[PDB]
């Protein structure tokens, strides 16, 4: 309930209002992703996860509950993601890479050579559900 004393990260400072900054950034992201073509994979994913995060920030007032439900970092690590996504959307708009070439071809190599168990392998835990929900949204 009380304000966050520290974020635990040097350089990252606690924002006194995080439900008021995240909501505005998500609204801007949703209003500025429109210029991307509708049938592009980037737009669908960005307009899916931004929509969920905007909703979640809308229902619940306190930042602790927002951190619990999203379960992906602190709100101060979400504000920076929202700002970076806005920047990326701008750079996508100016670059305009949406044009699929007529002579496009891609070699999708699928190697299955196993590796030992003791070799260092990056094994994360399960992602939050939206990371998959956006995935089926993209596939469909």
């Amino acid at each position: 309930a009380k304000v966050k004393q520290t974020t635990g990260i040097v350089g990252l400072d606690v924002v006194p209002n995080a439900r008021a900054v995240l909501i505005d950034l998500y609204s801007k992201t949703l209003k500025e992703i429109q210029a991307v073509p509708e049938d592009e994979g980037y737009r669908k994913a960005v307009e899916s996860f931004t929509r969920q995060r905007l909703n979640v920030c809308k229902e619940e007032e306190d930042w602790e509950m927002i951190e619990k439900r999203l379960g992906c970092g602190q709100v101060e690590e979400l504000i920076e993601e929202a700002r970076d996504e806005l920047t990326l959307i701008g750079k996508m708009i100016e670059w305009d890479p949406w044009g699929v070439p007529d002579d496009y071809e891609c070699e999708v190599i699928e190697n299955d050579a196993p590796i030992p168990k003791h070799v260092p392998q990056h094994r994360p835990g399960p992602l939050p559900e939206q990371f998959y929900k956006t995935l089926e949204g993209l596939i469909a």
């Binding site: 699929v100 070439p101 007529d102 002579d103 496009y104 071809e105 891609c106 070699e107 999708v108 190599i109 699928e110 190697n111």
Partner: peptide, 10 residues
């Protein structure tokens, strides 16, 4: 190896 090649596929 499954080195299949994609195409625009209209």
């Amino acid at each position: 190896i499954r080195r299949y090649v994609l195409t625009k596929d209209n």
